[PDB]
Amino acid sequence: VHINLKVKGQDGNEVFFRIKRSTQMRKLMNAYCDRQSVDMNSIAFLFDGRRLRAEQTPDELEMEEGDEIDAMLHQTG
Amino acid sequence: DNLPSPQDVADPELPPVRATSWLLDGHLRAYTDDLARRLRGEPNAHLLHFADSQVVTMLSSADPDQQARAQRLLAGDDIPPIVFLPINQPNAHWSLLVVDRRNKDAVAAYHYDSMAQKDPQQRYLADMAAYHLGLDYQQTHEMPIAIQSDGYSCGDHVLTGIEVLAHRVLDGTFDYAGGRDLTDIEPDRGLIRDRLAQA
Numbered sequence: 001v002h003i004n005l006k007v008k009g010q011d012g013n014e015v016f017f018r019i020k021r022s023t024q025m026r027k028l029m030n031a032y033c034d035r036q037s038v039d040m041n042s043i044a045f046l047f048d049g050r051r052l053r054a055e056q057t058p059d060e061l062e063m064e065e066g067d068e069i070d071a072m073l074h075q076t077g
Numbered sequence: 078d079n080l081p082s083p084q085d086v087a088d089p090e091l092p093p094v095r096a097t098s099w100l101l102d103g104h105l106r107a108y109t110d111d112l113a114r115r116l117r118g119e120p121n122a123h124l125l126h127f128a129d130s131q132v133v134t135m136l137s138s139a140d141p142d143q144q145a146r147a148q149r150l151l152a153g154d155d156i157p158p159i160v161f162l163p164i165n166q167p168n169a170h171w172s173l174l175v176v177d178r179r180n181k182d183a184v185a186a187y188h189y190d191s192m193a194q195k196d197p198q199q200r201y202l203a204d205m206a207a208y209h210l211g212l213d214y215q216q217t218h219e220m221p222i223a224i225q226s227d228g229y230s231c232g233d234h235v236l237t238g239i240e241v242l243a244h245r246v247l248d249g250t251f252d253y254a255g256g257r258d259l260t261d262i263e264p265d266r267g268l269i270r271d272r273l274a275q276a
Contacts, residue, residue: 040089054088072131075102075165
């Protein structure tokens, strides 16, 4: 019912999350952004090259125990 | 239970594109996602792969696992042989690197930079991407592309170059005289905004 996930930001440090497989990603996105003090409109979340959205759940995304998510600062030019 | 509530912060949304606004990495991936949809089912279309600019930057990560993940997503056994890599210099510039792996023993790499007086940082960032993909950066060709006359449309030149080169792969002119030459492209910010709106 629960799943352990990791989020890795550009600081290299990994942050461990434990949520339900039915929990939408916005809960994880908000909790991560509060640690870095940057809003969700300044950071992109990718899972194996797929950009994550607030409403999607780990089951819909076919995530597994120990999967890792990349959190990247927005790029402009 | 997990639904967004009106009393909390709204979900994130990619901001719209203006007439002279700088393009974000989210705008580039939305464009190439829509391009892949438009090309799906056409002959030679499955030889192409449009990379997310954040995965390209992940190649140079100081973290071992994040670096290896980017290498698998762009050069794994299941990745098409012609890859388009957007090269970002943060708060500065966009350029485009193309890697043609159709011959495993004769890989060719092409770099397009629409800036008039070129920044040594930009080619260095392209060389780091090639290096972490297992290539010799010294063999990358600096190729001709139309020079931008403004200070905002470098993202437009990257997306237009991907657009044009992809269709040359489809019809088969990519491998012949001038097939990799982008001197005559004319980026259209209005067309780019329309494709992002109709996606």
